Amino acid sequence: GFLDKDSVTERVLHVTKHFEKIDASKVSPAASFEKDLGLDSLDVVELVMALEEEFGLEIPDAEADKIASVGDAINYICSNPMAK
Amino acid sequence: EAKQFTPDGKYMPGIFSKAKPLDRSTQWVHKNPYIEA
Amino acid sequence: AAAAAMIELDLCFGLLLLILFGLLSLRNGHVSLAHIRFICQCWLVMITPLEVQDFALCILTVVLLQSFHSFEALLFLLLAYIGQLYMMHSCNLVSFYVCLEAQTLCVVVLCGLLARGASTSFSVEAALKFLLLSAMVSGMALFWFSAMYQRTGSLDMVGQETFWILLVMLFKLGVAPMHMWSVDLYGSIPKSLLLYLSTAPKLSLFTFWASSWHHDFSVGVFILFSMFIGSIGAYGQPALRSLFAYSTINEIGLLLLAVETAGFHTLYQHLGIYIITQLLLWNLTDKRLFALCAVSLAGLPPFAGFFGKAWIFWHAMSVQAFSLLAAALFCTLLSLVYYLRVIRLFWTAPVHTAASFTGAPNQTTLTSACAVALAFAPVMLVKPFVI
Amino acid sequence: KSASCYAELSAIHKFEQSKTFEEQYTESCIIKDRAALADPSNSVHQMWEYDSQTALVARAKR
Amino acid sequence: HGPAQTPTVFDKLVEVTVVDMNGIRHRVRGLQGQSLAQALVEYGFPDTYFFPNMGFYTQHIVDAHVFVPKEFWGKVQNVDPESDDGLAVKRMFRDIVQDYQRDTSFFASYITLGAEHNGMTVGIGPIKPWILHSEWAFAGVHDSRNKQFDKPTVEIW
Amino acid sequence: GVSSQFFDAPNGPSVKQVLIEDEWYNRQRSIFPLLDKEPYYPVDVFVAPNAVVCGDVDIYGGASVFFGAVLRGDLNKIRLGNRSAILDRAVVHAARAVPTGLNAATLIGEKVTVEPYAVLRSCRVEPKVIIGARSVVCEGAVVESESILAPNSVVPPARRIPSGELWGGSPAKFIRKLTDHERDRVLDDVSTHYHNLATMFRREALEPGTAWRDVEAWRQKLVDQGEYEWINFREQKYLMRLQHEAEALEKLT
Amino acid sequence: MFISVLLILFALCVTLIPEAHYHMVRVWSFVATIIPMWVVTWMWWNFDASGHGLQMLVILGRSHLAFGIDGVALSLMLLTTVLFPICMMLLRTVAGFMTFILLEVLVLSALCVLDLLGFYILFEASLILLFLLIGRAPYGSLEAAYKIVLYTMAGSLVLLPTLFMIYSECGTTNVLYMTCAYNHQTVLGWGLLAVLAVKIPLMPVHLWLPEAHVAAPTAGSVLLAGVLLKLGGIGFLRFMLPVVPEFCVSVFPLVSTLCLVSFLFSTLSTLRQIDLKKIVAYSSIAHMSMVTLAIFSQSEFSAYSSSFLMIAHGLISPALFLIVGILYDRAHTKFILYFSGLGASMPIGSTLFFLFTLGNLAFPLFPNFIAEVLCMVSIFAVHELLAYVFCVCQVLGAAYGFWAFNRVVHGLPRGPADVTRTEFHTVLPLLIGAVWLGIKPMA
Amino acid sequence: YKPEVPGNTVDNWTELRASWNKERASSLGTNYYLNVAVMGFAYWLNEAYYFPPRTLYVGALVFFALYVRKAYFSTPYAFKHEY
């Protein structure tokens, strides 16, 4: 709750939009990286690195491995006490 | 129904006793909150 | 003939032998140096003349050396004592400058050397600030001495340039508003150097003032600044080190009131009682005696601090210095509040005093218990004693 | 687990208990020297390096 | 009085997730009525995280800089900014935190753990170098394995 | 099995280990460290000569350890509050962990009295508490402030006694509420009474006394016969460490 | 002097008794205050009433601290030595015993000193003891302790330079030579007025008393009301009137209006009080205002009547504090709304309360009646209207006294049971003294 | 009975945080400027000791009335990007 649940959501959508292997209209506020968006592990790592670039954080390997959804990423950024 | 004295005097504190001992605070008033305020 | 100078040759020979003995002892890996400290105390006694003030300084420095443990610290304290002793005999600005600068360099180096733990950088920082602030005051002293030397053609300390030399002396006593170097020093530097800094140089400089100084000016605004700033600052600062720094500024304002109205007997009595209280304050391990320092620094009647304040008040009323006296009485009324805060902190509390584990069991109970008997000195203080 | 824990504890307690008086007094002198060496301004620190467990001079530092 | 439940410690347990300054999440258990700074001390956090409460008559209380989410902003205890306690908090913000301050910045002794804190996530905030006396200071770097809990006394002198 | 030699002890390995059946007089110390865990105590503490205080133990203020009592801080820390009394042959221990997940150290507040033959292990006792005789307070349990436990009572692990009440039984149940004067004065009275008794014992103690004269007479007789061995303990500790390092190096390669 | 050293050294031996012997500690501290009562009674036996004004003199060289006995000091010393064992019966710790023992040493030596610097040293050496007594941690009040200590320090700090001014002027602070030398009386008179108008509660420097006399324990309240206020009166009678009499004439309109407004405004404030201890605490200000105006009248036998009023107040108001202390000790409140019908539940305590209520309102067969009559004779002889102001306002004192008594004693019976043997014997010496001094005070 | 703390906890804590989001300066500048002011300009008060006492007392009250307190000092200029 360290930050709001709307601006972080649209920032997540904004950085999800510029991916060449993703669809710019299929992206939903509550989706999945594997079944819905069709991404393997390296694409997930690339998306998490883009989210880290936008919010100015550092997400370790286990925490980024637990993130499997847009809602999971939003909840992890919201729960982080060092967000920007 | 406490027993705070032996038959030959000798006050007993009754620390571990079940019955409530009569003592200095027995007649302390029950505080009304608005009066205290 | 050099036969009148054997004490100077003895000073130099003793330093030459003491350095060589300290070198030989350290080549054996001795981790304690009580033999070096005893030889240092013997050297202190052997170089001091037979005056009251000289022996007061000597006995004070002998007592102070029991809180210092390394060879270099003992050497720096001896070479600071040479400046402190010979400043009392200085009759010019040449020797005055050299003695003051030797003392400043020794204090700076000791502040750098003795810090430990997480407080090392804070002590080094405060030592650097003190050195920079001391350099420009030393420059002011040299500049106005050169002005006086050009005007008079001699080494007499007369004329308008003595006002700036007086300001140099007021800086060395931590007189407000030039007080913040001491406030910076109190917050970081360890307790043994704080004990050294509050006793010996004030005695040395006030004895020089009593012995060889006249000025045609006043110090009243600095009395007002010191008393009001020290009292209000000690009322407002929650850290105990800052409390004692500001209360020291208040006490030096009272000593300046004693200087300003002449009558140096009250000055010497209050300074002696203050020095004994300082010797008790910085060597305390039982915190109940912290309340005795509080009641004897608040001027409360039966203890000796009352007598030290009250002859200053008596002589000020004798020569009718009414406004400065009224300000002193107001600041005395204010000082009681934070000395009561001290009493609340350390007397109305459960007692805990940790035992020693690595030997040296409560090693300065002799001095602290001896200095607590400032409740028995008032019988001698009421008489015409200090004159 | 409780049985193994008390085996490990009885080892340490037997180690402390079965020391002689002379060893205990030597250890108290060593504790005293170590606390004297904990001062970083100690004048021997610039020449000698001391063994941690016995407070003896191990080597010359410089 | 009847067959009602015996009191257990689990009824009074409060769990707080704490993120230290390295980003490592920690599970911190406390009891109801205990302050947050005490639970942080008893968890085993290093002594560089803690500093004196800078009021008069309360420097024996250890305190820490914590970041509190907006949901739990109203469960920090109220301090009058005109009182002496308010000036104590102002001194702590002026001297210890300085430009590490955020809108979520509080102090951990002003948080009394209850059932409303159960599940709250906090983070430890950074602090500037400070000194109280020669035996209690902080040089500025959190490189020490010494716990605050292992100190036998908190010394104001 | 675990060896009884420690080469990483703070003061080094033990040069000479004495078997207990070869001891001709009792050498039990009352306050002693366990490797790097040293007890902490004040100047006015009373430790009885047959009481044992070992390991990581913190004692504060006017606390007292009476005859035959054990405070063993080897698995965790133990803290004894200001003017808290441990009476005759009571045991205070501590586990490495507790089921509640909290700190497992045994923490005893100020003005707490613990009656004879009671056992405290990894529990929390708040200030002003009377623990009765033959009572056990188990691992992770909490006794709240201004409360009384009746004699011969069991407090099971991770259980709680509420503040301001008297509890007793096996398992402990509610007996009655303490009166306001009992919470105000009586608990402090019991703690102060036992502190006064400890002060009476402390005034009459001649430490170290004169029992060493006989042992010194025996050692003087050994020096007379030429059978007293002078051991350079510092040098033997140094040489044993060097041999241990050489033996460790001569097996990895 | 040798006797006084022996009594001090016997009293100070309470600290060396081991605390586990409870009976011995109680008996030793009680006997340590019983003995000075016998010694002061013997001093009254030794006094020659047809002899000199100052008797049993002793002077300790060049240390100030010179001592002597007159009638006012002797009566006040007798009252203090009565009051201190009753205080010993109301304490339970060695810290309390030692604080009251040190207070008794300081009060007894201050009452009979003949040196102004000695009076300054001896009196306000009790300041830190009063601070610790009033601001005790669980049940005191630090605000009250700060107020009483700061007001007393302010007054004493005004006096101290004027003390030293007359000392430099003539060469001594001995009152026998200060009264025979030429001194600047306006400055010293203002310093002495500054101390003694705080010690005696005179408006506007009177606000410390309602806080301190209520926040104190029962023993502290007995001491503060019955003893420590009268040090201002004996300050007036011993030091200020003999040494600065020109000032004492010239300040009479100002002291007169201060006394009149203190009497009227403090009586008006006492009517709106809702705390029993605050009711008892305010009533002392009006009595001390009558004392001060009777001292300053200097008219018929002013020292006699004013000393007799000081003794009558010092007997009657500690007993009212004792009864309020019993109610607070066994009911845990001092609030009027919690008490009703105390006649049915404490008949002996209510009878004692009624008798001391009548005594405090200066009804006959109590020493306050004789005291107020003679004080108004002394006031009347300067002018009739200054007596009329006190005469017509007697309905205002009786209003608060009877209103407090009628509210707490009659009505529905609720409250604690009647007094014990110990409480009755704390009250009893004051009652016997009142009956004697109100029926046959003189022979 | 205990009195209620006046206000709101969020608003009070924002008041407590205000004007302290800034790195504190070292004290060397204040100390050096104080020493320069005293060593350069305190000789201007030498003749002031002989002035009439009404002037000196009114001047002391004026200095007290215009004094700004160093502790808890803050300026709006610390957080603006232009004059």
Ligand SMILES: CCCCCCCCCCCCCCCCCC(=O)O[C@@H](COC(=O)CCCCCCCCCCCCCCC)COP(=O)(O)OCC[N+](C)(C)C
């Ligand atoms: C200023 C004069 C002093 C008067 C003060 C008022 C005293 C209050 C009670 C009035 C009693 C009058 C007693 C008269 C005869 C007693 C002896 C006597 O003469 O009095 C003494 C002093 O009298 C006293 O000390 C009276 C003691 C009264 C104190 C009583 C209160 C204490 C008792 C408390 C209750 C105890 C009960 C215990 C039983 C259980 C000296 O006074 P003057 O005659 O004025 O001195 C003469 C002046 N010149 C030498 C210069 C010629």
Ligand SMILES: CCCCCCCCCCCC(=O)SCCNC(=O)CCNC(=O)[C@H](O)C(C)(C)COP(=O)(O)O
């Ligand atoms: C500065 C630039 C320098 C760069 C130099 C470094 C280049 C290193 C490249 C060489 C490292 C490798 O290829 S490593 C070899 C990678 N291939 C394998 O391991 C065989 C199994 N296939 C996989 O793992 C696939 O990634 C997948 C099926 C998608 C698994 O799906 P997920 O992913 O969901 O898990």
